[PDB]
Each structure stands twice: as structure tokens, then as C-alpha cells.
Design an enzyme around this catalytic site. Structure first.
Site, short mmCIF file in Angstrom:
data_model
loop_
_atom_site.label_atom_id
_atom_site.label_comp_id
_atom_site.label_asym_id
_atom_site.label_seq_id
_atom_site.Cartn_x
_atom_site.Cartn_y
_atom_site.Cartn_z
N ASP A 1 59.50 74.42 9.06
CA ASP A 1 60.06 75.63 9.68
C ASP A 1 60.16 75.48 11.20
OD1 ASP A 1 60.66 78.11 10.51
OD2 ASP A 1 59.23 79.20 9.21
N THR A 2 61.33 75.06 11.69
CA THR A 2 61.51 74.88 13.13
C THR A 2 61.46 76.19 13.89
OG1 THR A 2 63.94 74.87 12.91
CG2 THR A 2 62.84 72.74 12.87
N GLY A 3 61.67 77.32 13.23
CA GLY A 3 61.55 78.61 13.85
C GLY A 3 60.12 79.17 13.95
C1 LIG Z 1 58.59 83.02 7.60
C2 LIG Z 1 59.85 82.30 7.11
C3 LIG Z 1 59.66 81.88 5.64
C4 LIG Z 1 61.10 83.13 7.28
N1 LIG Z 1 61.34 83.53 8.67
C5 LIG Z 1 61.81 82.47 9.56
C6 LIG Z 1 60.74 81.96 10.52
O1 LIG Z 1 61.16 80.72 11.13
C7 LIG Z 1 60.32 82.90 11.65
C8 LIG Z 1 61.41 83.15 12.68
C9 LIG Z 1 60.97 84.13 13.76
C10 LIG Z 1 60.52 83.70 14.98
C11 LIG Z 1 60.03 84.57 15.93
C12 LIG Z 1 60.04 85.91 15.64
C13 LIG Z 1 60.51 86.40 14.45
C14 LIG Z 1 60.97 85.51 13.51
N2 LIG Z 1 59.14 82.36 12.33
C15 LIG Z 1 57.91 82.88 12.21
O2 LIG Z 1 57.59 83.83 11.42
O3 LIG Z 1 57.04 82.24 13.00
C16 LIG Z 1 55.62 82.60 12.86
C17 LIG Z 1 54.96 81.89 11.68
C18 LIG Z 1 54.04 80.83 12.31
O4 LIG Z 1 54.57 80.66 13.64
C19 LIG Z 1 54.95 81.95 14.06
S1 LIG Z 1 61.93 85.04 8.89
O5 LIG Z 1 62.16 85.20 10.31
O6 LIG Z 1 60.99 85.94 8.21
C20 LIG Z 1 63.48 85.23 8.12
C21 LIG Z 1 63.62 85.62 6.78
C22 LIG Z 1 64.92 85.69 6.23
C23 LIG Z 1 66.05 85.35 7.00
N3 LIG Z 1 67.29 85.26 6.40
C24 LIG Z 1 65.88 84.91 8.30
C25 LIG Z 1 64.63 84.87 8.86
#
Ligand SMILES: CC(C)CN(C[C@@H](O)[C@H](Cc1ccccc1)NC(=O)O[C@H]1CCOC1)S(=O)(=O)c1ccc(N)cc1
Ligand SMILES: [Cl-]
Ligand SMILES: [Cl-]
Ligand SMILES: [Cl-]
Ligand code: NA
Lengths: 99, 99
Positions: B25-27
């Protein structure tokens, strides 16, 4: 390019005639952008993860230029903390994760 | 490997001697895994996701293998939709985004 992951992989996108900064996110199934106007029909959707769910508007067949690369697909719009380019558009620009 | 994004980038990890599935998960700034027993002391941390900020437990210097690649680093434990391998460990294993 080749983007390292020491810092968040943020790029400039063009969507709906607007420039935005967005996160290249392999963990996101679908692209989700902060509130903005988009053309055409939409339908409501819920998406969720860390911290729970949010309600979004699903727009189909939207063109986004992502770091200079054009791609078309679904864009979700709603109260996301960060603009996210998800897999549905990363595939279209040929993005891969390499190690 | 070179991982395309047509499906979720799920891999097998090994932590605490056990094999688990996790999402590359790069995000995600951070690595967060579902409730399990890890050794040593933990410290508190707040992390943000799509739905808001949550409390997790931070364990440092934890041995983890990701798709066969050995790493040692910080692992968060808490309420998480999936096991998430975030940038702290993606960087360790030499992962980049390419397009
Ligand atoms: C958790 C994953 C499985 C799914 N997410 C993506 C993730 O990359 C998510 C992206 C993000 C970054 C910063 C703030 C808010 C969101 N990062 C994340 O939670 O970072 C946390 C976990 C540890 O480090 C910090 S999502 O945003 O829920 C999501 C769900 C559905 C769609 N279509 C798009 C996005
Ligand atoms: Cl799509
Ligand atoms: Cl491909
Ligand atoms: Cl680390
Ligand atoms: Na449309």
C-alpha cells in the site's frame, strides 16, 4: 519515472479543468478526489478503511491527466482527507510496483 | 518482481512465525496489521485513514518477511481492514513505483 517511497508519492493531476495534488495509492481500489464538480451522471457509494467509511459520488468515464499521462475511468468524489489515484487509473498509466 | 495493479497487490508475509496475507500500500505511511501477539514494549500512535484518525499500538524493530524479502522495522497493531504493508517497509525492501 521511478518514484521512491521515502516520502508520500504525490503527483500533480489535471481533472475537470483543475490542477490538484494526489497520492499514487496501490492500496486504493478506486480513485477518490475531494469535493469538486464533474460532468454527467453519478450514483452514491460508500468506501471505507482505517477510521471507517465515507459517502462519495461515483462518476464514470472521467478523464484525468496523471503526471502527464491521460487516463479515463471512474472517479469518486467526497470528503477524502487526501486526493487518491487508485488502481483503476494506475493500471491505465502502466504503473507497477517493483522490487 | 514487477507487480501490476489489475488486482489488489496482495502478498504473503511472515511475522511471528506465521504466514499472513497483506496488501502492498503506497498510500499508507505505516505498516499496520490485525491483532496479534508481538514481543516487547509498545508505544501509542495515532494514524489517519479515509474515515478519520485511530489509536494503534506501535512495536519497533520487528522481524517481518514480505514476499520473501526480509525486513526489520516498525509494525503497528490495531483495527485495520486488512494487513497493510506501508512505505516504511516498502522502502526497506527496495520497492518503487514505475510508469
Ligand atoms: C486502507 C486501504 C485498504 C484503503 N485505503 C487506501 C490507503 O492507502 C489509505 C490512503 C489514505 C491516506 C491518507 C489519508 C486517508 C487515506 N492509507 C491509509 O489508511 O494509511 C494509514 C494506514 C497505515 O498508514 C496510515 S482507503 O483510503 O481507505 C480507500 C478505500 C477505497 C478507495 N476506493 C480508495 C481509498
Ligand atoms: Cl474505472
Ligand atoms: Cl499491464
Ligand atoms: Cl520502520
Ligand atoms: Na459519466
Amino acid at each position: 519515472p521511478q518514484i521512491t517511497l521515502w516520502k508520500r508519492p504525490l503527483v500533480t493531476i489535471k481533472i475537470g479543468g483543475q490542477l490538484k495534488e494526489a497520492l499514487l495509492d496501490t492500496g486504493a481500489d478506486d480513485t477518490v478526489i475531494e469535493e469538486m464538480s464533474l460532468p454527467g451522471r453519478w450514483k452514491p457509494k460508500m468506501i471505507g478503511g482505517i477510521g471507517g467509511f465515507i459517502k462519495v459520488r461515483q462518476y464514470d468515464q472521467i478523464i484525468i491527466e496523471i503526471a502527464g499521462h491521460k487516463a479515463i475511468g471512474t472517479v469518486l468524489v467526497g470528503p477524502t482527507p487526501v486526493n487518491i489515484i487508485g488502481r483503476n487509473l494506475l493500471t491505465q498509466i502502466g504503473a507497477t510496483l517493483n522490487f
